[PDB]
């Protein structure tokens, strides 16, 4: 098995697996997530690599349970399910990815950006795209 894709959210004391993050955005459906991540369903080696960190996440399906799962690990976790849900929702809408947009709703593009990150990670893993160089000043300001 092994090879589980996870995330390290800001102001969250513990890492969380990815599919819980996607469902926290409200993507309860499963085909939507893989559409966001995999842009072509014809290469089996690419698509099989998400199964490890997809079978790890079948307990959580609804949005509220995902938000509570996130909030249980917050910097100041709530004492009520409403507190956990609102805290996790606020930290996702504000702290996570301000550059894509902090408008009233940005899930339609935040999900695509997370999918792009995961797709890049899988591309690096499969060897279809070499790693980035820290010394290259195209990557510096």
């Amino acid at each position: 098995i092994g090879q589980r894709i996870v995330a390290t959210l800001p102001y969250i004391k513990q890492e969380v697996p990815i599919i819980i993050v996607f469902r926290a955005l409200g993507f309860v459906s499963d085909r939507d997530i893989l559409e966001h991540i995999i842009y072509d369903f014809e290469d089996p080696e690419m698509m099989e690599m998400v199964k490890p960190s997809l079978d790890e996440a079948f307990v959580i399906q609804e949005q509220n349970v995902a938000l509570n799962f996130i909030g249980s690990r917050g910097a100041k976790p709530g004492v009520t399910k409403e507190k956990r849900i609102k805290y996790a929702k606020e930290v996702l809408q504000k702290e996570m990815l301000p550059h894509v947009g902090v408008s009233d709703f940005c899930e339609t593009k935040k999900a695509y950006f997370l999918g792009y990150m995961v797709h890049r990670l899988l591309l690096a893993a499969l060897g279809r795209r070499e790693l980035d160089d820290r010394d290259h000043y195209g990557n510096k300001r």
């Binding site: 591309l123 795209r129 000043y137 300001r141």
Partner: protein, 49 residues
């Protein structure tokens, strides 16, 4: 590229990078990038005359 070389809407500071191995096009307009001027070759001659 043509609009930047005419310098009408895209200022000369903007850099357009197109990747071909992966179909991406990247555009940067932020501060801090380091750039130097260079001559332009059209086919095999110079635009400098």
């Amino acid at each position: 590229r043509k609009l930047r070389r005419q310098m009408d809407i895209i200022v000369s500071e903007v850099s357009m990078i197109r990747d071909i191995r992966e179909r991406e096009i990247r555009i940067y307009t932020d501060a801090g990038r380091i750039c130097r001027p260079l001559l332009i070759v059209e086919k095999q001659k110079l635009l400098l005359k």
